[PDB]
Structure formats: structure tokens, C-alpha cells
């Protein structure tokens, strides 16, 4: 019965909107739910030179891209939370659901 939903997004408050939506769903459908486990954030860091050519004073850009991850566990059959997980899909957040 141990279904696991992994919510992954670049935006935090859009991730927290979908996360707080699925817990509201699990609780209003009377299901055992492990709260959202905040897995450590990953910082995709690339540092470039700023100039296209060579002859400017040595200046560097520092581009970052944070990626955030929650996972919520559920003790329930597949098709109930399938109807819940189909509800409230945002353009930003990315969902992956495993069964066992």
C-alpha cells in the first residue's frame, strides 16, 4: 500500500502550494500520510567569464539554479490518490509517483 509521490520544482512557494494541496487531499479522503520530507536542495552552479573577448579586466559571472525536492508517502490503494494527484497540476512543479 506504500505509494510515494516525489514533488520537484525550481520555485519553492509553487512547490509548497502543490505539497500543501496533496496533504489537504489525503486528509479529506481519510488516508495515512507521512508529512513532506524536505530532501536537501541542489545548487546547479556555473561560473563564466563576463567578456566575449579576452581584453577586459578579469570579471566572472556566478550563475546559480536551485532545485527543491519534497516526497510524501501514503498507505492507500492506487486509484483514490490517482484522482487527487490528477487535481491541481501547476506548470512549475514536477510529480513522479511509485507504488511499492
Amino acid at each position: 500500500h506504500r505509494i510515494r509521490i516525489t514533488l520537484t520544482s525550481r520555485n519553492v512557494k509553487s512547490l509548497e502550494k502543490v505539497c500543501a494541496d496533496l496533504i489537504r487531499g489525503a486528509k479529506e479522503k481519510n488516508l495515512k500520510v507521512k508529512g513532506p520530507v524536505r530532501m536537501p536542495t541542489k545548487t546547479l552552479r556555473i561560473t563564466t567569464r563576463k567578456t566575449p573577448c579576452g581584453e577586459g579586466s578579469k570579471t566572472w559571472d556566478r550563475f546559480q539554479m536551485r532545485i527543491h525536492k519534497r516526497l510524501i508517502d501514503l498507505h492507500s490503494p492506487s486509484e483514490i490518490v490517482k484522482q487527487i494527484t490528477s487535481i491541481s497540476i501547476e506548470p512549475g512543479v514536477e510529480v513522479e509517483v511509485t507504488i511499492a
Binding site: 520537484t8 525550481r10 541542489k42 546547479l44 539554479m65 532545485i67 525536492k69
Partner: peptide, 19 residues
């Protein structure tokens, strides 16, 4: 699926697709 790209490489691939 079988190739099974990492979240880092997947999200950059999603970004380059838009670019």
C-alpha cells in the same frame, strides 16, 4: 525510463528545450 537522466541534467534539458 531506461536512459534515466538525473534531476540536474533533466531540468537543464527542460530549460534548453525552451531556449
Amino acid at each position: 525510463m531506461a536512459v534515466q537522466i538525473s534531476k540536474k541534467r533533466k531540468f537543464v534539458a527542460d530549460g534548453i528545450f525552451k531556449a
